[model samples]
Target: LGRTTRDDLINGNSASCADVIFIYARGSTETGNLGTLGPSIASNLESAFGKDGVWIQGVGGAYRATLGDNALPRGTSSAAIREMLGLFQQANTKCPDATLIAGGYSQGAALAAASIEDLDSAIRDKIAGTVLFGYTKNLQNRGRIPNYPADRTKVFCNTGDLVCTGSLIVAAPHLAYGPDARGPAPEFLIEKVRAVRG
Candidate 1:
């Protein structure tokens, strides 16, 4: 009963289990939380796992995703992270059997990275994979999120995208991930989940 083409777990939707529960955060100034790349990856995941097997939700917050928000005090979005934490907690509590997967684009990547660090080990261990596009946390976190397995994370950094290198510049390459990397994102996520399940 709690399903829609657009998922809003942080607002009205109740936490429910599917084969994959994907929590994604949108980039700075992105309209609608899923952003550009999020929908592409969501479509791909649905193809692989079937629509009913995948439940996608966007990170909820009033962070605004402004240019200034990209340069946070700790290189992470505190408000976004707070919303992400709530999503994780709800999913972990209500849908313990679902495989958890998180994703984000640009500044949203920073939120995903920082949020993972705040998770308890029990919930953290349930994360099957993470996908990041034009990750803004690359240089700040040494291209990896601490406490999250590097192998289970797939980051798409297009050529010449300064943001991927941790710069604030929003180059053309930074905005090209949706059409460029969508085909591969879900493949990586599902592969990781396969390995975890095995």
Candidate 2:
């Protein structure tokens, strides 16, 4: 169960259901791509929403396995689109009252970026907000993030990070957001949640 819950799902100790379900699929590497900014922002959300208010589900779909060979997971991204979608379905079904929110970086960011398009409008409509950093599709000149509603999805791209901008550098701006992005990322989630609940 590669899932993180503020509290066990069945315990029901909290007043009600989850406030938000966060979809975080880690990037490349058997390195667990647990996400650079993921942990911090999650903690921040915990502070704001209370531990019992959130659920973090992991989606490590596939890996390079060997150089030049395609990853085992769909397109080598951790967690296939189907798997992610399934998780979304489960969360919504389990917590019909909750708002769904997704965010990621690097491969994670790219995955969230692309998958938004395939999501059904009603499902997408349930998402209160989204955030993506170091988006990979930007390198290709076109990126598709579907149905998230205007301004609900926030974006930040570093000037020197080659992934989105077409630079090969691994560090610098590509790696800059881990600690640096802490403030804005969670700040937006909190603000969005307040707005959504308001």
Candidate 3:
């Protein structure tokens, strides 16, 4: 938990006419068919939301490919949270009319969750939806925080995912969204975006 974040972390295209922007966090080292959860879902969202959608580089650290960095005392988590929070603030101020679709997987999901409470209330209000896969904060043992608006945050745990179940040992379901995660996860994001848009 001793590392620093990049000076420029947010990357995206601004569709001045578009009202929605996505902020997704990538999980540990890119792996499997989709490469990693964040980008996989991003491509899918791009399919639904269009290429004009904004992209933010999720935070990463020394142990990005390992299992331990997703937890407390890990520098990656705080750095990611802070950077994302700053992005949210900037977006809220600069893009006053747009809605944010904040999301992540595993540690990225944890960072998304951690940044929620510390954010400005006005910024939090601008979040149209939150999507998380194998989210660590969903686990039974983790302390609950002021998450996104209850009706707006959608989480996918995929049955036995140990990251969300407090088991830590079960690895198969940990990355359960691999390969075809692009399909279902994007469906959820699109649905939420539409549900909240009107």
Candidate 4:
């Protein structure tokens, strides 16, 4: 019914450039690196740009997001951060002309934001958009990624998702972002990417 939540851009499996590249970080304890929403996003992107026009890459790591790790600045493991940053660099190097889009769900959303913050202006400039589903920093950043372009970022926080309020609670709303936001998430990203290329 859909694409797998696994991509090999970092592995150089296809070794071909795309018009756009998506770098995703899955949530804590999620299966595979792309988790649920990433695949949906990738499939939509592929539909919009043709299969080879897009490249999807996920940050590979344990995705622990343990209590101790959550106590840190980004509420994500250092290993996740490193992997995410590495993906960004690798993608940028491989597809110099491709517009970059970054995203994640829950803790992975926080990981994406944290990694985006760490990017230098050069890499940051290459990014056309970011999507965060149930972002852990939703309340803290007032529903935006700090220092990032508001028009270029979309953060989805369900009404009852406690995580959106910056709480540690794992409510049902937090878990529903994948199935719920799939439609609009990729649409927004595609629009942003198009705007960037224009």
Candidate 4: worst 10 consecutive residues by lDDT? 1-10
Estimate, for each residue in 20-105, the C-alpha lDDT of model 1 and write its tens digit: 78888888877777867777887888888887777888775654667787777645557767878888998877677778899888
Query: In candidate 2, what are the lDDT values of residues 70-139, reduced to their tens digit?
Result: 2222223334565567656666677877887877666666567556666777777777777777766555
Which regions of candidate 2 fall more than 4 Å away from where they truly are?
A: 1-16, 30-33, 61-79, 139-144, 166-171
Best candidate (score: lDDT): 4
Residue lDDT tens for model 3, 106-156: 776776777776788777887777777787767542433364567777778
Q: lDDT per prediction?
A: 0.77, 0.62, 0.62, 0.80
In angstroms, how far off is 148's CA in candidate 2? 3.0
The TM-scores, one per candidate, come to 0.89, 0.78, 0.75, 0.91
Give residue 186's error in model 2 in angstroms.
Answer: 0.9
Per-candidate clashes, comma-separated: 0, 5, 1, 0
lDDT of 4 by residue, 1-198 (tens): 135455657655335788898888777766677767788888898899998888888777555545456657777877878878888887778777789998888888889888888887798888899999888989888888766789888988899999889787988988888664468889998999999886
Ranking by TM-score: 4, 1, 2, 3
Candidate 1, pairs of clashing residues? none
Whichever of 1 and 2 has more lDDT, that candidate is 1
Pairs that collide in candidate 4 are none
